[PDB]
Homo-oligomer: 167 residues x 6
């Protein structure tokens, strides 16, 4: 039983982590697709795919989630929403369930015959990339919304410095 | 210490496996980039990125190589050889050494200031994608050139049937 | 005498139909280019090129307009407005007149030396893709703005279900 | 019952015509996809999609085949063979059977669950685009391999002049 | 000592000219990259790369700035901000300093290890492409914001006519 | 009177230089388009657009040809030969004559209504990119086929080292 989770992870936060945990309770393995892998250096998508790979790797690992239980696959976007599901399938291992709270993602996979599950929201109020960026720019408390290992990486790559320079 | 290996893995064979083993002897982790991830269904590149992801996953895992010691990242090709190194860097975690026997790959990374190591050849005669395909088409003994788990996947996806239909 | 009409047809409505009728009064044949053929599953452009092909086919046919009097050619968009006219010319048969109410379309074809005619508006108030979608989402009376055969197709492909899920 | 035929039609010849006729005997309508629509001005693919649209239109029409029995849809190629079937589906109306003598085309549609029929060859010896071009360049008798209306178009666009200048 | 200036030059105005002059005071040569070279016919980016090439050529030349002191290189945009610096480097001669008031441009080149200088603003209030277009559309006094030779070109290509038709 | 010359300049050799000289005898200015600007690091196209920009700049300049008499514009290739002429026009200043010995280039511009001149060959035997590369790889006398300033650049960028590593 292999599930699939698609997210930009800009950046990978506690919301993303709790849901990945819920999913690992009902699936043997989880394919984690880092979407919009070609985007970076924008307030909405500031980190590169590679940097996001490190964030998930350290977070999941520091959280005791075995490496053999997931796959981290960067996926660039394409112009045709109609071929997007096939695009994912071409780049990933087989999967039976799709987890997403994104309407377009859910609809596209539904039309394709896949069972789509919208995981429960875990403090959508504070645990959102929008909020994380919003706090970084306004000197708010962003570190609280992210796993410690994710904060460490953002520190090592000078994430905040980058984001502020862009705003 | 993190190294980087780039290969099409069409398909992942014993040659690829032994070298990955040699590299794991001098590096803590290895980033395995499945190149030409957008190519499939051709005699030269018959399997999709996703199918190749399964091949490496089962092989490495069946060979007792811990999941935490490597990253499997599919990478599509781009039109400019000049930006290809940056393209890899954007999609991967940081790395210190590059392993490749491909002249273009070696040169591009050299020009970029990376130390490039050309791993020793392990029976280049039989352990080559060219040979594997050559034997599949001519009913030769291809199973011997591939890890058992890789043969199993090729069986489950009907690889041989596909390749023959294409030739 | 062959004219050219360019439109997204998202979806094909009574406005599009009346104008196609006006044009067939002064031209032997009409080339109908379904623009933005690569877009789908968005509130602005919900249907695929193929689905739109069916809409026009059934509508025009049900309206007694002979098949030999028009060509339905899907056309994807390109990044350079400067080459867009050439892009259309490359994919279509020769034509003498261009019909459009779109400023960019008109200007581009003018600069290219083509006579451009802005057909008269037929109830632009209700006969607009914006309005059709607006009514589908708010349970309004959309069926009235579309040819019956177009409503039938939207029913057979579950258009409304899709659009609502996206909003 | 709607079938699908995919071909470059470089140019549309008697071979293509007879097979389209055979197919119309067992299907209500035929979707004719002009593949490699982005290619032109090469010995292998000398005519543009638009020019090929005219060739099929005049040929089929001059042969008494009603316009309502087919769709002519230009289709550009894409880099991923894995998404090519979806690419066609996105741009065309629904279809039940696929006709092709091309191994890749057949395999791709098979893997996708479509019944694929390889139509019988009608003088593959002389009725091939390779041969048509071969004769045009060497002043051979090419006109015999093509429908009269197709010869007329090639004359009106100066096809032979173009091809020779390229060789 | 070779510097690099990146700008859309939509259109090339007095602001762009004064800064190019300031830069020529501390650098032997200046590489002038006309960015977004693939964009044209939009209120934000109305002129083609070629038209912009003429604007800079006449302006700089009419201003007595020797041709041997600069390079005018059109540069199309790419989807990955992460490879954009490499993209510029691939298309230009070597350079030591980067001049820009654009946050993204500055940040990207900084991350890449280049010294970035934000030239002083010269009447940013009136000397902006936004303002030039704003005045052209509202019959304002745009000619005052542009070098005379630039006005002449805009006259010869019917710039104002184009822009108004688009708005 | 402005002419247009299109060439890959891989690398810029004495053949390219003499012809540029012949053209400057009958035209006020020459637009020199460095084609295939996206290609590099291949035996056929080893240098980047930027490196080629330096080659032409030093060569032309060292040959006393005033900078104001030419434009050096890098041009990436596109997939549709049908839009290629428009692609060039979009990126360059206006021009009246086209100079090329390339059949495709000549044909495309002819079809577009431009007068095309095939300049006389100047020792096509030795003055060809094929030959230059052929000699670099086989330790032949390549320096003789290139302007001195071009040899200097190839030395400063380690051209020979690169090419050999690729072969
Ligand atoms: N190229 C295409 O045509 C196409 C079509 C569809 C989608 N996409 C891609 O999909 C990606 C977008 O993913 P996204 O916007 O959903 O990313 P995201 O990171 O914002 O969301 C990822 C997942 O996290 C969940 N999540 C976030 N915060 C949560 C919280 N506090 N509690 C519980 N769950 C929470 C969301 O519900 C979602 O399932 C992009 O890369 C996009 O480009 C591409
Ligand atoms: N897009 C670009 O501009 C660009 C530029 C360069 C390279 N690339 C990509 O690089 C990839 C090509 O990789 P490749 O051709 O080397 O793949 P490959 O699978 O043939 O080789 C991968 C590695 O395996 C090693 N290897 C294979 N058999 C071996 C054996 N028996 N013993 C020891 N070592 C062995 C090779 O030396 C090499 O380092 C493609 O995806 C290509 O497109 C892309
Ligand atoms: N790729 C490029 O560079 C580029 C440049 C220009 C245009 N395009 C394409 O052009 C297409 C846009 O076409 P559009 O926005 O006009 O589509 P549309 O469907 O909104 O309009 C199509 C036509 O219908 C007419 N029309 C609509 N309702 C009418 C009514 N009630 N009465 C009378 N006439 C009515 C419009 O005036 C227009 O001529 C897109 O595919 C766009 O991407 C592409
Ligand atoms: N983009 C992608 O990934 C991808 C993948 C597969 C195919 N394609 C496209 O498919 C198209 C290729 O089609 P093709 O090469 O088959 O074109 P073609 O014109 O050579 O052949 C078209 C059809 O005509 C039939 N035919 C030709 N001569 C005949 C004769 N004398 N008697 C009977 N039948 C005859 C062939 O069997 C075939 O089914 C291209 O556009 C190609 O790019 C694209
Ligand atoms: N493709 C990518 O990923 C990517 C990433 C970054 C940037 N870009 C490109 O960079 C280009 C954008 O350049 P831009 O928006 O800065 O162009 P612009 O023409 O608006 O500005 C160019 C320069 O002029 C200066 N300037 C303008 N008016 C001035 C005045 N009155 N006084 C002093 N200085 C003045 C600006 O500070 C800037 O350095 C685009 O082509 C964009 O696409 C591309
Ligand atoms: N993207 C497209 O669709 C498309 C279509 C056509 C051409 N192109 C581009 O055109 C470029 C190809 O140019 P090319 O192959 O001619 O480059 P090239 O450098 O080989 O030749 C350039 C010019 O030099 C001349 N020349 C070379 N040696 C000479 C000598 N000894 N004496 C006299 N004249 C000599 C040739 O006749 C030619 O006019 C490429 O960038 C190609 O991609 C692109």
């Amino acid at each position: 039983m292999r599930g699939l989770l698609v997210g930009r992870m800009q950046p990978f936060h506690r919301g993303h982590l709790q849901v990945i945990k819920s999913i690992l309770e009902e699936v043997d393995e989880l394919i984690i697709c880092i979407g919009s892998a070609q985007l970076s250096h924008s307030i909405r998508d500031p980190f590169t795919a590679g940097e996001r790979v490190m964030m998930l790797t350290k977070a999941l690992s520091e959280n005791g989630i075995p490496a053999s239980r997931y796959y981290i696959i960067p996926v660039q976007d394409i112009e045709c929403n109609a071929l997007w599901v096939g695009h994912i399938k071409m780049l990933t291992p087989p999967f039976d369930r799709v987890y997403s709270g994104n309407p377009l993602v859910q609809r596209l996979f539904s039309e394709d015959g896949y069972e789509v599950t919208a995981p429960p929201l875990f403090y959508r109020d504070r645990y959102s990339g929008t909020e994380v960026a919003r706090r970084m720019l306004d000197d708010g408390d962003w570190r609280s919304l992210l796993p410690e290992s994710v904060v460490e990486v953002i520190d090592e790559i000078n994430g905040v410095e980058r984001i502020k320079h862009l705003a």
